[PDB]
Amino acid sequence: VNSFSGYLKLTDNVYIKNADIVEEAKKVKPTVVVNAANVYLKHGGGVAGALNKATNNAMQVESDDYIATNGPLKVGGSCVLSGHNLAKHCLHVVGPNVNKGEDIQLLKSAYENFNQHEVLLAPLLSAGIFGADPIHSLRVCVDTVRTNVYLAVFDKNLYDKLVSSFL
Numbered sequence: 208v209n210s211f212s213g214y215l216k217l218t219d220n221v222y223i224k225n226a227d228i229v230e231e232a233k234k235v236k237p238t239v240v241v242n243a244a245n246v247y248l249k250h251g252g253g254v255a256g257a258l259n260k261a262t263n264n265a266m267q268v269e270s271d272d273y274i275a276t277n278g279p280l281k282v283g284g285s286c287v288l289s290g291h292n293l294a295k296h297c298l299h300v301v302g303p304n305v306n307k308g309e310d311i312q313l314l315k316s317a318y319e320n321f322n323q324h325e326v327l328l329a330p331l332l333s334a335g336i337f338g339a340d341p342i343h344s345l346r347v348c349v350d351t352v353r354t355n356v357y358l359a360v361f362d363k364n365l366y367d368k369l370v371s372s373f374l
């Protein structure tokens with residue numbers, strides 16, 4: 208038994224809710240929150256900008272030190288950093304950005320990072336301002352992630368479409 212409340216069960220291991228991931232993280236304080244990162248860990252907008260704002264920019268300060276030491280992530284890759292006031296850890300995962308021309312086949316590689324963590328609070332990778340079809344992102348998630356994932360979908364309209372179209 209864990210602390211996640213109000214989720215619809217899609218599969219053995221995947222759950223979904225219409226929720227602001229920031230507000231969900233603040234309430235649950237999960238072991239792992241996933242960020243929809245870019246390779247530079249520049250948390251300007253979308254999920255990343257909202258998570259970073261909720262940390263009072265501490266996420267960005269830590270991220271800048273990480274990049275200065277290690278260089279950029281790979282598209283499809285990840286790193287584990289602090290969760291600050293939101294979670295124990297933040298798993299920064301880079302899904303392909305369709306609005307930059309990145310290979311959508313890299314979405315499966317992105318979701319494979321989640322399998323290194325027993326439980327995660329996450330957004331749909333490559334959705335929103337990353338330009339991918341969220342229905343596709345949910346299918347890749349279900350077909351790739353084997354650990355327990357709690358998906359927060361900000362947009363109520365999209366949430367209802369994801370549930371009602373789920374196979």
Ligand SMILES: O=C1NS(=O)(=O)c2ccccc21
Nearest residue numbers: 334335336341360361362365
């Ligand atoms: O894919 C998406 N995640 S979201 O809920 O932020 C959203 C809002 C509007 C259009 C698309 C999308």
